[PDB]
Design a protein around this motif. Structure first.
Motif, PDB file in Angstrom:
ATOM      1  N   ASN A  64       0.780  -1.240   0.000  1.00 61.89           N
ATOM      2  CA  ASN A  64       0.000   0.000   0.000  1.00 61.89           C
ATOM      3  C   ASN A  64       0.814   1.294   0.000  1.00 61.89           C
ATOM      4  O   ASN A  64       0.224   2.379  -0.081  1.00 61.89           O
ATOM      5  CB  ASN A  64      -0.969   0.001   1.194  1.00 61.89           C
ATOM      6  CG  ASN A  64      -2.039  -1.063   1.086  1.00 61.89           C
ATOM      7  OD1 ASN A  64      -2.559  -1.349   0.012  1.00 61.89           O
ATOM      8  ND2 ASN A  64      -2.375  -1.679   2.198  1.00 61.89           N
ATOM      9  N   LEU A  65       2.143   1.198   0.175  1.00 58.20           N
ATOM     10  CA  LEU A  65       2.977   2.393   0.234  1.00 58.20           C
ATOM     11  C   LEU A  65       3.122   3.032  -1.135  1.00 58.20           C
ATOM     12  O   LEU A  65       3.242   2.318  -2.134  1.00 58.20           O
ATOM     13  CB  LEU A  65       4.361   2.027   0.769  1.00 58.20           C
ATOM     14  CG  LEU A  65       4.384   1.509   2.203  1.00 58.20           C
ATOM     15  CD1 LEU A  65       5.796   1.043   2.559  1.00 58.20           C
ATOM     16  CD2 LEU A  65       3.900   2.590   3.185  1.00 58.20           C
ATOM     17  N   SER A  66       3.129   4.371  -1.163  1.00 59.99           N
ATOM     18  CA  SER A  66       3.290   5.111  -2.417  1.00 59.99           C
ATOM     19  C   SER A  66       4.731   5.588  -2.579  1.00 59.99           C
ATOM     20  O   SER A  66       5.090   6.127  -3.619  1.00 59.99           O
ATOM     21  CB  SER A  66       2.320   6.290  -2.475  1.00 59.99           C
ATOM     22  OG  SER A  66       2.605   7.247  -1.470  1.00 59.99           O
ATOM     23  N   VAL A  67       5.560   5.382  -1.553  1.00 61.49           N
ATOM     24  CA  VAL A  67       6.974   5.802  -1.558  1.00 61.49           C
ATOM     25  C   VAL A  67       7.786   4.680  -0.935  1.00 61.49           C
ATOM     26  O   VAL A  67       7.400   4.149   0.121  1.00 61.49           O
ATOM     27  CB  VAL A  67       7.199   7.142  -0.764  1.00 61.49           C
ATOM     28  CG1 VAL A  67       8.677   7.529  -0.733  1.00 61.49           C
ATOM     29  CG2 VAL A  67       6.355   8.291  -1.324  1.00 61.49           C
ATOM     30  N   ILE A  68       8.894   4.311  -1.591  1.00 61.13           N
ATOM     31  CA  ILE A  68       9.819   3.305  -1.071  1.00 61.13           C
ATOM     32  C   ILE A  68      11.196   3.940  -1.068  1.00 61.13           C
ATOM     33  O   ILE A  68      11.678   4.389  -2.115  1.00 61.13           O
ATOM     34  CB  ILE A  68       9.805   1.979  -1.895  1.00 61.13           C
ATOM     35  CG1 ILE A  68       8.399   1.304  -1.903  1.00 61.13           C
ATOM     36  CG2 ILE A  68      10.912   0.997  -1.399  1.00 61.13           C
ATOM     37  CD1 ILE A  68       7.884   0.755  -0.522  1.00 61.13           C
TER      38      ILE A  68
HETATM   39 CL   LIG Z   1       3.337   6.012   1.575  1.00 59.37          CL
END
Ligand SMILES: [Cl-]
Ligand SMILES: CN1CCN(c2cc(=O)[nH]c3ccc(Nc4ccnc(Cl)c4C#N)cc23)CC1
Ligand SMILES: CN1CCN(c2cc(=O)[nH]c3ccc(Nc4ccnc(Cl)c4C#N)cc23)CC1
Ligand SMILES: [Cl-]
Ligand SMILES: [Cl-]
Ligand SMILES: [Cl-]
Lengths: 125, 5, 125, 5
Positions: A64-68
């Protein structure tokens, strides 16, 4: 069925279109941060190319994360070259980038890139 | 393109 | 750069992994409804294979939809065969499905499938 | 696999 016909260029045409969507920022759903640099991509393409991204985006929280954020030891140019390879099958391997490309490919778990890097280094010894 | 795979 | 090397199997390996994600319902982001039948897929793969889906998911409102209903004249088996082709490059073309496959490919705007359907019909005349 | 494209 075993009676199928196959369109030879289909897989490469699909990848060309996925790269065009990436270039135009269409339906990109993740930002990969490598030190000061940000790279927009499609999670499915990343998973399809990298053992590390496959593990990350199959995780029930990380999916579900939009940033890694990648490890700070990862070289942004090495990542950029590998991201281009994921979307095109073409690897811009050069004397000046091979060490960074190989280290990044080991971290991302991209065995074929690691293999060609090892072969190119061994040939220069 | 088409072929028999 | 023009100094790139290329991994021949990369595009087909990517497509195989995208099909494995589809089979396991991983990161699928749209349901295509064809009469009574529902098909889960990845919008980027659909756009990469079909002129109709490319138009739909580049629309500023439709890009956000999680369900797309196709015209009720579309045959679900014809759609299923085309969805499998999108994810595998293999088209299960048979005497009993060719008319539905061709009509569906015309609607979805998949020129290469339309072409082979036309050639197979012309050969049977 | 690798080739010169
Ligand atoms: Cl995120
Ligand atoms: C567990 N394990 C798995 C594998 N890995 C790797 C390593 C390399 O090298 N590469 C690479 C690519 C790519 C990948 N992807 C995948 C696989 C399988 N399946 C599927 Cl579905 C997917 C997706 N998406 C991966 C990898 C690792 C880990
Ligand atoms: C406008 N126009 C365009 C084209 N179309 C078609 C027709 C066919 O056939 N196919 C087909 C595939 C596929 C497609 N996709 C695409 C293209 C381009 N680019 C990109 Cl980015 C994309 C994506 N994703 C498409 C089509 C149509 C319409
Ligand atoms: Cl690889
Ligand atoms: Cl919706
Ligand atoms: Cl096609």
């Amino acid at each position: 069925a075993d009676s199928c016909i196959q369109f030879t260029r289909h897989a490469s045409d699909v990848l060309l279109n996925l790269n065009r969507l990436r270039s135009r920022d269409i339906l990109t759903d993740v930002v990969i941060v490598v030190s000061r640099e940000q790279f927009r991509a499609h999670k499915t393409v990343l998973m399809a190319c990298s053992g590390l991204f496959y593990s990350i985006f199959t995780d029930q929280l990380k999916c579900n994360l939009s940033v890694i954020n990648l490890d700070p030891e990862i070289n942004p140019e090495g990542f950029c070259i590998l991201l281009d390879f994921m979307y095109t099958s073409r690897l811009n391997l050069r004397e000046g980038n091979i060490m960074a490309v190989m280290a990044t490919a080991m971290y991302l778990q991209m065995e074929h890139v690691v293999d060609t890097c090892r072969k190119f280094i061994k040939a220069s010894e | 393109a088409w072929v028999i795979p």
